[PDB]
């Protein structure tokens with residue numbers, strides 16, 4: 699522990715405070731902001747900033763610094779919300795700067811497309827402008843799997859993998875968020891975790907399965923109308939699983955069931971999920987041949 703005390707390479711991460719223009723809050727305290735020359739992708743770009751509340755306790759200060767160090771340790775990957783810089787030197791508050799995902803969380807976004815989805819578009823395709831398709835959904839799944847494969851390879855156990863924690867950027871790029879931290883979460887927890895309290899990469903795979911259900915239900919709430927009590931936990935341990943979501947393919951539902959294997963060691967690995975989802979994305983394209 700005590701990650702906040704790890705060596706910090708200022709030459710690589712320190713960012714000038716006045717090269718940052720704070721904007722409106724995104725949550726709490728995360729703030730949207732404009733950065734000037736933080737990377738070689740453009741002169742100006744929007745970013746997300748986690749700022750240490752003023753009058754914060756020493757403990758809270760250590761927590762935020764620890765988060766920064768953990769982000770640095772983990773490293774970069776296209777499918778995770780990446781660290782861009784930090785303001786740690788005297789003269790102002792501690793700030794951690796990350797990439798900004800313009801479209802918010804995936805669950806909310808998918809729910810907004812309930813009446814704007816078709817498995818495959820048909821010509822004239824303009825009748826389905828901006829609609830989601832099976833390709834989009836499988837692609838989102840594929841991306842998160844790749845992001846988790848990377849996190850798992852860095853020995854990072856997410857613990858709260860859910861659609862609400864997947865953010866959408868431009869060009870349908872999705873990123874996993876809240877992975878370097880210090881309602882009804884039980885609906886995403888593996889049986890061993892509910893009863894034994896220990897999180898592992900394998901319990902993250904179980905959560906990934908629920909996330910897939912969320913994606914192919916277009917943002918629906920897991921276990922529709924079910925009371926999440928002891929009876930639920932008991933039935934889950936016994937083998938009860940959700941039925942297929944409305945927009946799933948047969949292969950995707952089986953993959954959901956595979957991720958929900960009662961035995962942790964029998965669930966697929968994220969690397970296996972990456973290979974499989976990639977294969978399904980490729981096979982789905984083979985179904986859309988009007989323009990071949």
Ligand SMILES: COc1cc(Nc2ncnc(-c3cccnc3Nc3ccccc3)n2)cc(OC)c1OC
Pocket residue numbers: 724725728746747748779794795796797798799800801802803865875876
């Ligand atoms: C549509 O507008 C929204 C945009 C975002 N984007 C975003 N982009 C980057 N990082 C975070 C982010 C959000 C919450 C917590 N952390 C982060 N990123 C972060 C991680 C580590 C260190 C600092 C920031 N969020 C999130 C929203 O809500 C989820 C949201 O709806 C209001």
